[PDB]
Amino acid sequence: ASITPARVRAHVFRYPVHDRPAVLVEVEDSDGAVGWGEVWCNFPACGAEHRARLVETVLAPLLTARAFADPAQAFAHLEARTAVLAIQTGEPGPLAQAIAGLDIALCDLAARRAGQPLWAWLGGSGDRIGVYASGINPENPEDVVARKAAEGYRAFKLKVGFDDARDVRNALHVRELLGAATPLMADANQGWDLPRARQMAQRLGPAQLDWLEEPLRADRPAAEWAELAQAAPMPLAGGENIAGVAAFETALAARSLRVMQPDLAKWGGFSGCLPVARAVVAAGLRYCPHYLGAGIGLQASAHLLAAVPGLASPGLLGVDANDNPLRSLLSPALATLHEGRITLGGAPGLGVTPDLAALRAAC
Amino acid sequence: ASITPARVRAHVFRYPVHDRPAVLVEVEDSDGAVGWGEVWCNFPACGAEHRARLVETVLAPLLTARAFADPAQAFAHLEARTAVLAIQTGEPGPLAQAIAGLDIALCDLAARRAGQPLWAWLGGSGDRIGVYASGINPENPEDVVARKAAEGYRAFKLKVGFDDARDVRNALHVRELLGAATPLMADANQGWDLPRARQMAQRLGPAQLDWLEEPLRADRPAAEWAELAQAAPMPLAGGENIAGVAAFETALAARSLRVMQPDLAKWGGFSGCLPVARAVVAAGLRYCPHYLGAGIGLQASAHLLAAVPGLASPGLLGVDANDNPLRSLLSPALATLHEGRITLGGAPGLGVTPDLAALRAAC
Question: Which residue numbers in chain A precede an interruption (C–N > 2.5 Å)?
Answer without folding.
Answer: 17
